[PDB]
Amino acid sequence: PGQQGRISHTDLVIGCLVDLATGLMTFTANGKESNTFFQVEPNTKLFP
Amino acid sequence: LFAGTEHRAIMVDSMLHTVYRLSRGRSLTKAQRDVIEDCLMALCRYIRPSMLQHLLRRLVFDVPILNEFAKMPLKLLTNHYERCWKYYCLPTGWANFGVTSEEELHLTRKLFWGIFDSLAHKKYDQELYRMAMPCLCAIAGALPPDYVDASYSSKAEKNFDPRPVETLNVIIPEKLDSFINKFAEYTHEKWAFDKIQNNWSYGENVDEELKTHPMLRPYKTFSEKDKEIYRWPIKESLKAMIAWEWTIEKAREGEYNPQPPDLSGVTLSRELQAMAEQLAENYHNTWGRKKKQELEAKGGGTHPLLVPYDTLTAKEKARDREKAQELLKFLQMNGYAVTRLDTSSIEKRFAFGFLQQLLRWMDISQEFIAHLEAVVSSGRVEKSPHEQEIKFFAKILLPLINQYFTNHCLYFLSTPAKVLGSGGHASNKEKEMITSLFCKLAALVRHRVSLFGTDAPAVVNCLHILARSLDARTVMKSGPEIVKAGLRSFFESASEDIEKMVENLRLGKVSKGVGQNLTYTTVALLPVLTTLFQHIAQ
């Protein structure tokens, strides 16, 4: 929360991880694990 | 090669200004001046319309003087608007060039009206009238008839001196000093708010990039000098605000973030905005006042931005109008009501004022033609005091009327149900005004074709165009009895003249009054009436 001086000199690196054997998808903010997670069925195709 | 220089606009504008300023140069021969003028023209041709905005602003302050230097700029503007009329007039604009901003249209309106008023007041000068024989016509054609200016007021402005009114010589109220102190404290409150937004804390230590002089110290310890030098502009501003006959009345007697956040969400009444932009213009007049107090010592290099607050750019206008609106809002919230004309959009339109002035000049025409019949009948005088009025009318207004109502004919015939024009339809009131002008001109020329002399063909052509412009259906169904009676009287008079001519040919008369009626009919009446019948049938 930095609406004050909302413009940030820093760069935001969002990481996306997938386990192709459990169908689990997770995300990282700047090396910090996000709460959002997804579960997908086998044989699913996903594009970045 | 200058066509696509949208990325070096700064350099292009600087070069345009340099060439214009050199054109306005003493010790400069005619050949050199002509070379400069040709260069400026050629650059303007290929340069995009958006690019010239600043030059147009400067010309808006130059040309209306109508001095010897006003010749070339008039031709420049004529050609520019002739070629770029789509840019301004059409809503979609000119292909690949976009559309007008709105400030450009404001400048165009100001230039039109300044030239119009100046030429009306000035004495006949065949050269100047010929240079405006290309006339305000390009300007008017470029301007949409429906253009409504955000700001509608009186300039009350005049080398160029921005002068406020200041009561410093007189004592200042102690209640007002209390107000200044409250305002300065609340300004320091917005100042801490601003530091909270910028996210940099007060620094008691000096550091180059924050450049925070160690004087940064909570109000508990600030040195007086900084406080009163921040205050003095506040004193000047409040004193000027009251000096400009604006009454300040604190509604009720009185006994940590700034409680009134400046909220742009709050809509402001139109009146209240107008005062806000005027008080921002007063802040900018104080700005130019101190800049001029400084410059007069220099005597040269007038700071380029020193120009009318309305003419200059909105973004620079933004800070001053923001401060003015903030101060006002603070006054109303606290109860320190500051008090002391928005003609609706239709009245604000350009065509509305243009037709109003044309009708006023038709009244003047009635007056001095009547005086002309009186003088020619007896006691002939060669002076002709209204000479200037006659020349202005015939030379400027008639061609301008012709061109305007030949270009914008559809805007007047168009209706919401049925639209000929690409965009816009005239208001019923504007239709009434055009009808009244047509009837007035017909009455004015009635049996006075010789008195008008060589201007009679121009009168007849203007009448043709006006007839083709009229929306008689709308005017007659929903129009004042005055306009309807004027048109009916036109028809009755045309009839009567026809019956008199026809009996004269019946040779009940010799076939002078009959000859004068005959020439009036043949020259003006039958053509105009035939045109009107054709337009009605169409």
Q: How far apart are the first and last CA of chain A?
A: 27
B196–chain A nearest CA distance, Å: 8
> SS3 of B459, please?
helix
Nearest CA in chain B to A3: B197
- Chain B residues in contact with chain A using a Cβ-Cβ cutoff of 8 Å: 196-199
d(CA B367, CA B386): 10
Q: Which residues on chain B are in Cβ contact (under 8 Å) with A4?
A: 196-197, 199
The four Cα atoms B172, B176, B179, B181 give a dihedral, to 10 degrees, of 30
Nearest CA in chain A to B197: A4
Q: Which residues on chain A are in Cβ contact (under 8 Å) with B197?
A: 4-5
Q: Which of residues 5-24 of A touch B (CB under 8 A)?
A: 5
DSSP state letter for B303:
-
Q: What's phi and psi for B462, nearest 5 deg?
A: -60, -40
* CA separation, residue B298 to residues B14, B142, B291, B483 (Å): 22, 41, 11, 60
Cβ A5–B198 below 8 Å, yes or no?
yes
Experimental technique of record: cryo-EM
| B392 Cβ contact list (under 8 Å, min separation 6) | B119, B120, B124, B361
d(CA B4, CA A30): 44
B9–chain A nearest CA distance, Å: 28
Q: Could you identify the residue written with the tokens 């030949």?
A: B406
Q: What's phi and psi for B222, nearest 5 deg?
A: -60, 140
Tokens of B212: 């925070």
Q: Which residues on chain B are in Cβ contact (under 8 Å) with A5?
A: 197-199
d(CA B321, CA B319): 6
Residue B235 C-alpha from the chain's centroid: 33
d(CA B275, CA B363): 35
Q: Which residues on chain A are in Cβ contact (under 8 Å) with B261?
A: none
* CA separation, residue B397 to residues B171, B318, B355, B403, B404 (Å): 53, 38, 11, 10, 10
| B535 Cβ contact list (under 8 Å, min separation 6) | B467, B468, B470
B206–chain A nearest CA distance, Å: 23
Nearest CA in chain B to A7: B198
Q: Which residues on chain B are in Cβ contact (under 8 Å) with A2?
A: 199
Nearest CA in chain A to B198: A5
d(CA B44, CA B52): 7
A4–chain B nearest CA distance, Å: 5
A11–chain B nearest CA distance, Å: 19
| B356 Cβ contact list (under 8 Å, min separation 6) | B433
* DSSP string for B174-228: HHHHHHHHHHHHHHHHHHHHHHHHHT----SS--TTTT--TT---TTT--HHHHH
Task: Assess contact for B40 and B19: CB atoms under 8 A.
Answer: yes
Q: Which residues on chain B are in Cβ contact (under 8 Å) with A3?
A: none
